[PDB]
Ligand binder design. Structure first.
Ligand SMILES: [Mg+2]
Ligand SMILES: [Zn+2]
Ligand SMILES: [Zn+2]
Lengths: 496, 115, 67, 82, 186, 186, 99, 49, 50, 258, 148
RNA sequence: AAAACCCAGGGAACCCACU
């Protein structure tokens, strides 16, 4: 019979690198002629819908259908064995929208909450009491996400923009910036959810949800997050534009002043090298020392300009919204768009003298300046000069060449690895033997523990002082009052 | 090829109920109203009106999928008041409001056309 | 090729404006003045004439195959 | 080897459960008698899962030790993973 | 007719298939009746650095409101973002092309201000009806009793070596046997 | 087999392209003053790769012939226009310098795949895999080079009102949401 | 690279002085030290870019290359020299010569 | 034969088309077209159920 | 889960903690058997975890 | 519960567009009215094209598409016509369809423009809208011709965009965002709306928490297929009819449940 | 009747180290007589608070003056007399941390209660005699009202 | 002449795309 809803299929993308490149899904019938799949499945597949086409296999027998359903369902491989961390994560658009959703200043009228709750599959039908009762019934976005979080799980994470000095002084439990993620009793207490909380990082919220709860519960957790945050995103809305790429005139003056200072700094370094007044660093030639100084000045200029540019985002710029959530982009991406592209590099160094001692026929011979050797002082907003545009093409061509050649050399590698270890398994005596029953390890991973159910932990016995170790672990029973405060009196006299 | 026709956005088929009532079991006095072959163009207004009743505790609507023409309206009213009668009162209120707006628009057109 | 009948975004009837648009262009009018002389306030309707290429005349140079 | 020398893990690991479910649903689909009282189902895989939760699958699993020996664990004797 | 899955691309490497098609009433709209034709992901910009796409959008708004075909030569120095913004401001629009978009479903105006404007999109040859194909026990090769190659001859997909390796890693031995023997060439 | 490009000829610190050359060149088809007449005039000349290693070539006259803190002050040739370093497919990119070079390469690759009126007499040609478009449009945002590629006579793509907005969640991963009404309007 | 001669030099720590070459260590420090050295070196290249891979997979690859006494290079020159089976060795790059 | 036919071989009951994103279905659900579903069959055993 | 309210003094005997941990360590078995070779393997398998 | 009392104030009424204000109603009601303007208003459009002959450079489906999108004057006939699928006729009749006939041959050296005027209907009321020039369907070289019979049938915007009577429906509420539904990062840069009433010194109105969306502004520009006011009247009538049908189905479901 | 804490505070500083959020800001307030500090996140838009204002703050376990101990579900149709009518700004949230200046030998003198109202935090640093009614992971209200 | 077309029996090389 023709396949109906609920059927099991195998769903894989070439090249199948790891075991999450081939999953089992349940069939849903939709009209149009494409494979509609969910969003969080993108990350394990590395398929960005840019014309990507997928392969779908159907298990014909009934016995193999159960084999896939008990092994190859996507809830059962949320956590990878290679790095004991989740691989599903949250896609960019949900991640940016949920980062804005979980902010402290987010408030929802009764109707918008009343709409959002309809998309929770795991909702018991009880509307939570608003965080604001008077003057108006007003729910906080964190309350809505608290309904999303299933069961009773407890995690502590840090937001991407959490200041490192905040936990030192006061406010370490009441964060002024709401940059401390604290989930308690299955309820989101406080904090803003960046990629370090809902992403694929180890110890994230989804990873703990997979372990503390089951695997079907986490499946509902992923679906609930995507549905309700996208629906709230309709009311909120997220965009990007040129107003997100323009800094105020004061910042532009700062950028130009830094470049002019750095450009003049390189020139005075160059005139020092010409007059032999530059001294060679011990360990390299006077050329390499000169190249080091030029690289250091330009790298400092790029960093200072990038830092100064990323200090004028006004907290409403969408570039910062995407980078802070960690969904798409980085601080380098904002810096090059707004302030300065920076030095272009080929084979790890500056632009070589393709012509006779000049990179282009447009510069004078033996010109080691920033512009002549490939440094670009303009940004993508201002546009590149033709000499800089060609030098930018220099770097990009190197990137594509690396991408095109890496595939063949890397691709040969895993085939050698797999074919070398295509028969290494764990026998029923918990030992690791190859095809010819030769023991490789007495226990798998020298401990017999699978790579999915492990977490990063901290050994408290390691790195105290000797007195600190004794103070924290000895359980001094001689003190009276300490025993009185810690234990009940019947137990206190029992120990004493 | 797999492109569905144009007429399934509003046309029902044999054996297809326009409205299906399913009494919710999670909380008392709650029902799910499944409207077939329809979209936001009625559900949004029904939700908005059901918010105006002071005895309705929950009233929302959603589309399971934009490619499937069906909506579900979940209505939870206070005990001693059925959700079904809330729904049928909201529909009558909308009919009354749209009718009133209709003759008022007629009157406005008449006032405009001869000054 | 031929001028579209309606604005893609609006549905505003633009197919009858092309001949008048050409007449205004040859009438020593700026195309910006021609657009709002034809009554196109929304720029989505203005792009239908500002960016249209009338390739149908190039197609009409060839003799018809079937006669 | 007798039950005194029964050294394999008492837990039904995931491969064994996955194959038991498939080979039991195949039998149920082929008009095999059902071990547990079903509340009305058409999918035989759900019936096999119900039997798994009831620990009443009439299958003894033969775990081959790598030396050549083998153990015979009952499904009801194995502790279910989930 | 353009359907979902059809591959569209801008003039900046911003390619992409059609995710879904809504009617005019469901599409958002500005204060005027202008509804967008294409709605693209904001996340495709920051990593790809297609600032030229944004500048093209702004210049398109300026050109369509002004009534002239704008110039976009690479190295001009006479047309920068500031001049384009100043020209756009004269036509009653925002300085940087953002516009207040109203929701198509609820009608509530979107809290954010959507960047909108006319760009030049181009449709690629890679459409989905040319690529979609399925198979169930179709024609079988004559050299070996395996399925054909290519959808033109109703061929089947190849379960290559890495797929076999992945199914070994999954431990789905029965499924691997099914694929490689029962479903390919018993 | 040598590869050369024509370049302006620079005297002491001055171009040889005087105003009279522009005056005579504007009135083509009347004075019969063609490009070859300018070449024979000793104003422009073809320079190959070999001679480029021994020439000091300026960007533009407005910058590198005015007295300043002197860079070289010994220019021999001047570039006619920097935008001419691009190819035929990269010349259709609006503001190509504002993008990232991989994006420009991807656009140049896809520019050859965009469907449209590929030839004027397509109705006579029995071409295999012929793709033409109903209503191709010239780009609102264009470059000066398109007047010579004749892209405004055989365009490929339609100017569209795009909005860059996160939305219901179908413009997620390099995907686009389209307007059903617009598509229904061709 | 030269161990067993640098370690002989005075004022040089003979305990912590590691190396980069793997073959050289196998001649000097044996097979088990290579299993540790290859582990550290392979972990170094994997974790250089900040990526993480579980130690279970590192241990298995290092052990399968040293479960024969000598360095089992992952090529036809090292895989197809152990008694695994004609079909296993022919399943690799060289097919006819093995069979 | 070993690699091109024995290890990796063409298989029946398989489909290949472009993927489009969809957030309105669970992570374990895939939306296949009707024509693929109307050409791909599963062997179901006839039982009185 | 158990609503500790850790401000109040606790009510578990510390000898139960020591005995519970020792019993728990016996229950965590990687290597079966009773001979000292298996005992050493079991000790080494869970040495870090214990 | 009960429904509030809305009111209408028409600012202008032109043969092309209508501009008016609806006050004292919910946001969802106004949005639904806009959506019904766009989609649920039924008009008459060409849907069945039979190409008897064609020699133009444009192919047949292109001509059919261009003919379908041509607006038709259906100010009063669309209320009388039954839906083609709902008529008991022999798959076509004047009670659910309007016949159109085109027969043009270019027998001259000049490029003959087959315009909307060449469409000849049998019903004098249902004619193409085109002061303004006619709708250019196709140009013809000498010797080329096209003959076709086209049937136009009742439909609305959900079926296809060729049944869309509205050129543009401008919708905005609270032009000075006192509700602060949208948040300008820098409100000084934002130009004021047409209905704004603040002095040029002020950027946006002060926020009020107790406010609600009201006083909705409409600008419904017709494409010519219908008058801008009959579009609104038919939209309200159709929305009321849909609500009535939904209530009837609800009553049937309730009496079935009881 | 169900009141866990009550005092009159005075606004001293409003988000002095910067304005992080447009709709909510934190208020550094001192008690009128009890000499305790209170830092409260408040919605400025619906309840604007200026510097130097004086307000009463009454943390209560329940709104109902009978102490019926409601579960915490949203019941807008309950017409029983609640104490919210006497006030003008009710924030409902959960206390999650009660730290204090304590020693392993003697008791704690200065306590610090941490409560989150959905996403709005409030730290109340006072004396142990006044904060004794607070319990970790307990259900409370806010009930503030400004006065001249 | 079950003309159960229960619906290919061609291969090879090259080029071009997409990931
Ligand atoms: Mg891709
Ligand atoms: Zn328009
Ligand atoms: Zn009829």
């Amino acid at each position: 019979r023709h396949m109906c809803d609920g059927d099991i299929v195998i769903f894989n993308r070439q090249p199948t690198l790891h075991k999450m490149s081939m999953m089992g899904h349940r069939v849903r019938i939709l009209p149009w002629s494409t494979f509609r799949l969910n969003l969080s499945v993108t990350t394990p597949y590395n398929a960005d819908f840019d014309g990507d086409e997928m392969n779908l296999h159907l298990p014909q027998s009934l016995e193999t259908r159960a084999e896939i359903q008990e092994l190859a369902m996507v809830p059962r491989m949320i956590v990878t064995p290679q790095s004991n961390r989740p691989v599903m994560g949250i896609v960019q658009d949900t991640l940016t929208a949920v980062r804005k959703f979980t902010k402290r200043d987010v408030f929802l009228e009764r109707g918008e909450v009343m709409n959002l709750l309809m998309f929770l599959s795991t909702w018991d039908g009880k509307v939570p009491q608003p965080a604001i009762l008077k003057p108006r019934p007003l729910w906080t976005g964190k309350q809505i996400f608290s309904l999303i979080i299933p069961g009773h799980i407890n995690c502590i994470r840090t937001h991407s923009t959490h200041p490192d000095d905040e936990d030192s002084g006061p406010y370490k439990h009441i964060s002024p910036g709401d940059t401390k993620v604290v989930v308690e009793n299955g309820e989101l207490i406080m904090g803003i959810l960046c990629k370090k909380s809902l992403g694929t990082s180890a110890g994230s919220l989804v990873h703990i949800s997979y372990l503390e709860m089951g695997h079907d519960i986490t499946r509902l957790f992923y679906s609930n997050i995507q549905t309700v945050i996208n629906n709230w995103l309709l009311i909120e809305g997220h965009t990007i534009g040129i107003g997100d790429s323009i800094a105020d005139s004061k910042t532009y003056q700062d950028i130009q002043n830094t470049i002019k200072k750095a450009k003049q700094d390189v020139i005075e370094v160059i005139e020092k090298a010409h007059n032999n007044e530059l001294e060679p660093t011990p360990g390299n030639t006077l050329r390499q020392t000169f190249e080091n100084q030029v690289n250091r000045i330009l790298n400092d200029a790029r960093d200072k300009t990038g830092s100064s540019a990323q200090k004028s985002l006004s907290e409403y710029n969408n570039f910062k919204s995407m980078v802070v959530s960690g969904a798409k982009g980085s601080k380098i991406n904002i810096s090059q768009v707004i302030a300065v592209v920076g030095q272009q590099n080929v084979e790890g160094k500056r632009i070589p003298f393709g012509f006779k001692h000049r990179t282009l026929p447009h510069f004078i011979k033996d010109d080691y300046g920033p512009e002549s050797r490939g440094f670009v002082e303009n940004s993508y907003l201002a546009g590149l000069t033709p000499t800089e545009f060609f030098f930018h093409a220099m770097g990009g061509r190197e990137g594509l060449i690396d991408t095109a050649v890496k595939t063949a050399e890397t691709g040969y590698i895993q085939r050698r690895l797999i074919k070398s270890m295509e028969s290494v398994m764990v026998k029923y005596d918990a030992t690791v033997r190859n095809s010819i029953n030769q023991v490789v390890q007495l226990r798998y991973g020298e401990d017999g523990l699978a790579g999915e159910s492990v977490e990063f932990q901290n050994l408290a016995t390691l790195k105290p002082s000797n007195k600190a170790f004794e103070k924290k672990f000895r359980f001094d029973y001689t003190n009276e009052r300490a025993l009185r405060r810690t234990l009940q009196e019947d137990l206190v006299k029992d120990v004493l | 090829m797999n492109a569905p026709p144009a007429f399934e956005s509003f046309l029902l088929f044999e054996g297809e109920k326009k409205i299906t009532i399913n009494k919710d079991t999670k909380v008392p006095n709650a029902c799910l109203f499944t409207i077939n072959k329809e979209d936001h163009t009625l559900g949004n207004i029904i939700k908005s009106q059901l918010l105006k009743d002071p005895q309705v505790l929950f009233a929302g609507y959603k589309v399971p999928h934009p490619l499937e023409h069906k909506i579900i309206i979940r209505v939870q009213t206070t005990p001693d008041y059925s959700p079904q009668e809330a729904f049928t009162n909201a529909i009558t209120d909308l009919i009354s409001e749209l009718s009133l707006l209709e003759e008022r628009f007629r009157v406005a057109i008449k006032d405009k056309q001869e000054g | 090729m031929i001028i579209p009948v309606r604005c893609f975004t609006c549905g505003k009837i633009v197919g009858n404006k092309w001949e008048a648009y050409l007449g205004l262009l040859q009438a020593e009018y700026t195309e910006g003045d021609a657009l709002d002389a034809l009554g196109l306030k929304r720029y989505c309707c203005r792009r239908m004439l500002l960016a249209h290429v009338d390739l149908i005349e190039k197609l009409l140079n060839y003799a018809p195959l079937e006669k | 080897q007798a039950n005194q020398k029964r050294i394999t893990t008492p837990y039904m690991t995931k491969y064994e459960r996955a194959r038991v479910l498939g080979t039991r649903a195949l039998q149920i689909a082929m008009c095999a008698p059902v071990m547990v009282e079903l509340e009305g189902e058409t999918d035989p895989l759900l019936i096999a899962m119900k039997e798994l939760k009831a620990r009443k699958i009439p299958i003894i699993i033969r775990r081959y030790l790598p030396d050549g020996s083998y153990e015979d664990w009952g499904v009801d004797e194995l502790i279910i993973s989930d | 007719i353009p359907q979902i899955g059809d591959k569209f691309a801008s003039r900046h490497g911003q390619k992409g298939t059609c995710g879904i098609q809504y009617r005019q009433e469901d599409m958002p709209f500005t204060c005027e009746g202008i509804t967008p034709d294409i709605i693209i992901n904001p996340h495709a910009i920051p990593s790809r650095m297609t600032i030229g796409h944004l500048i093209e959008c702004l210049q398109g708004k300026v050109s369509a409101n002004k009534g002239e075909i704008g110039d976009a030569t690479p190295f001009n120095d006479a047309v920068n973002v500031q001049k384009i913004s100043n020209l756009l401001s004269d036509y009653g629009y925002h300085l940087r092309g953002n516009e207040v978009l109203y929701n198509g479903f609820t009608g509530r105006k979107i809290t954010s201000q959507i960047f909108i404007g006319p760009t030049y999109y181009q449709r690629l040859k890679h459409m989905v009806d040319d690529k979609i194909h399925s198979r169930a026990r179709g024609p079988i090769q004559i050299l070996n009793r395996q399925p054909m190659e290519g959808r033109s001859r109703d061929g089947g997909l190849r379960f290559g070596e890495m797929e076999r390796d992945c199914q070994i890693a999954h431990g789905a031995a029965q499924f691997l046997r099914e694929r490689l023997f029962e479903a390919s060439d018993p | 087999g040598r590869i050369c490009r024509p370049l302006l000829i620079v005297e002491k610190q001055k171009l040889l392209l005087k105003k009279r050359h522009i005056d005579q060149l504007k009135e083509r088809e009347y004075n019969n003053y063609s490009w070859q007449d300018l070449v024979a005039s000793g104003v422009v000349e073809y320079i190959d790769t070999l001679e480029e290693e021994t020439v000091m070539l300026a960007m533009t006259p407005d910058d590198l012939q005015e007295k300043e803190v002197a860079y070289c002050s010994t220019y021999t040739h001047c570039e006619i226009h920097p935008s001419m370093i691009l190819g035929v497919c990269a010349s259709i990119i609006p503001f190509p310098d504002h993008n990232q070079s991989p994006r420009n390469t991807y656009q140049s690759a896809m520019g050859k795949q965009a469907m449209g009126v590929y030839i004027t007499n397509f109705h006579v040609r029995m071409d295999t895999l012929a793709h033409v478009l109903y209503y191709p449009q010239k780009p609102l945002v264009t470059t000066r080079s398109m007047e010579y590629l004749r892209f405004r006579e055989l365009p490929a793509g339609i100017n569209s009102i795009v909005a860059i907005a996160s939305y219901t969640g179908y413009n997620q991963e390099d995907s686009v949401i389209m307007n059903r009404s617009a598509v229904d309007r061709g | 690279v030269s161990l067993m001669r640098v370690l002989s030099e005075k004022d040089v720590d003979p305990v912590r002085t590691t190396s980069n070459d793997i073959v050289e260590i196998f001649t000097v420090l044996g097979i088990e030290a290579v299993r540790k050295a290859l582990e550290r070196e392979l972990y170094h290249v994997i974790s250089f870019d900040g990526s993480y891979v579980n130690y279970r997979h590192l241990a298995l690859l290092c052990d399968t290359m040293t479960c024969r006494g000598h360095l089992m290079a992952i090529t036809r020159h090292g895989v197809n020299r152990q008694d695994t089976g004609p079909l296993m060795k022919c399943s690799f790059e060289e097919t006819v010569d093995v069979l | 034969r070993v690699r091109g036919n024995l290890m990796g071989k063409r298989v029946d009951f398989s489909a290949r088309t472009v993927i489009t994103p969809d957030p309105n279905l669970s992570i374990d659900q895939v939306g296949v077209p009707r024509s693929i579903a109307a050409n791909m069959t599963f062997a179901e055993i006839v039982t009185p159920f | 889960i158990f609503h500790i309210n850790p401000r109040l003094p606790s009510d578990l005997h510390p000898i139960k903690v020591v005995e519970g941990v020792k019993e728990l360590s016996k229950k965590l078995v990687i290597v079966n058997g009773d001979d000292p070779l298996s005992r050493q393997a079991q000790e080494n398998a869970t040495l870090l975890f214990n | 519960p009960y429904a509030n009392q809305p009111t209408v104030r028409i600012t202008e009424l032109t043969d092309e567009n209508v501009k008016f204000i609806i006050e004292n109603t919910d946001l969802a009601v106004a949005n639904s009215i806009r959506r019904v303007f766009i989609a649920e208003v039924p008009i008459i459009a060409i849907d069945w094209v039979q190409i008897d002959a064609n020699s133009s450079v444009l192919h047949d489906e292109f001509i059919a598409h261009r003919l379908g999108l041509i607006p038709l004057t259906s100010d009063d006939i669309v209320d009388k016509l039954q839906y083609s699928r709902d008529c008991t006729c022999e798959e076509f009749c004047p009670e659910c369809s309007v016949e159109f006939t085109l027969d043009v041959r270019c027998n001259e050296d000049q490029t003959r423009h087959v315009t909307s005027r060449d469409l000849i209907s049998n019903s004098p009321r249902v004619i193409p809208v085109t002061e303004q020039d006619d709708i250019l369907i196709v140009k013809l070289r000498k010797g080329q011709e096209l003959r076709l019979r086209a049937y136009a049938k009742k439909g609305f915007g959900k079926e296809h965009a060729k049944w869309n009577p509205t050129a543009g429906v401008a919708f905005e509420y609270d032009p000075d965002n006192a509700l602060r539904h949208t948040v300008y990062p820098k409100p000084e840069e934002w130009p004021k709306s047409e209905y704004s009433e603040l002095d040029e010194d002020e950027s946006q109105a002060p926020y009020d928490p107790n406010g609600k969306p009201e006083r909705f502004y409409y600008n419904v520009e017709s494409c010519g297929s219908l008058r801008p006011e009959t579009i609104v009247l038919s939209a309200l009538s159709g929305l009321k009819k849909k609500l009535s049908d939904l209530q009837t189905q609800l009553s049937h479901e309730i009496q079935s449940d009881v | 009747a169900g009141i866990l804490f009550e005092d009159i505070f005075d606004v001293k500083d409003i988000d002095p180290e910067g304005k992080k959020f447009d709709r909510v800001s934190r208020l550094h307030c001192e008690s009128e007589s009890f000499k305790m500090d209170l830092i409260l996140d408040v919605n400025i838009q619906i309840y604007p608070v200026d510097l130097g204002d004086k307000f009463r703050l009454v943390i209560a376990s329940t709104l109902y003056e009978d102490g019926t101990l409601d579960d915490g579900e949203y019941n807008p149709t309950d017409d029983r007399p609640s104490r919210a009518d006497q006030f003008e700004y009710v924030m409902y949230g959960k206390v999650y941390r009660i730290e204090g200046d304590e020693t392993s030998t003697e008791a704690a003198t200065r306590l610090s209660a941490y409560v989150s109202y959905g996403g709005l935090l409030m730290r109340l640093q006072g004396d142990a005699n006044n904060l004794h009614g607070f319990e970790v992971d307990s259900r409370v209200y806010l009930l503030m009202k400004k006065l001249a």
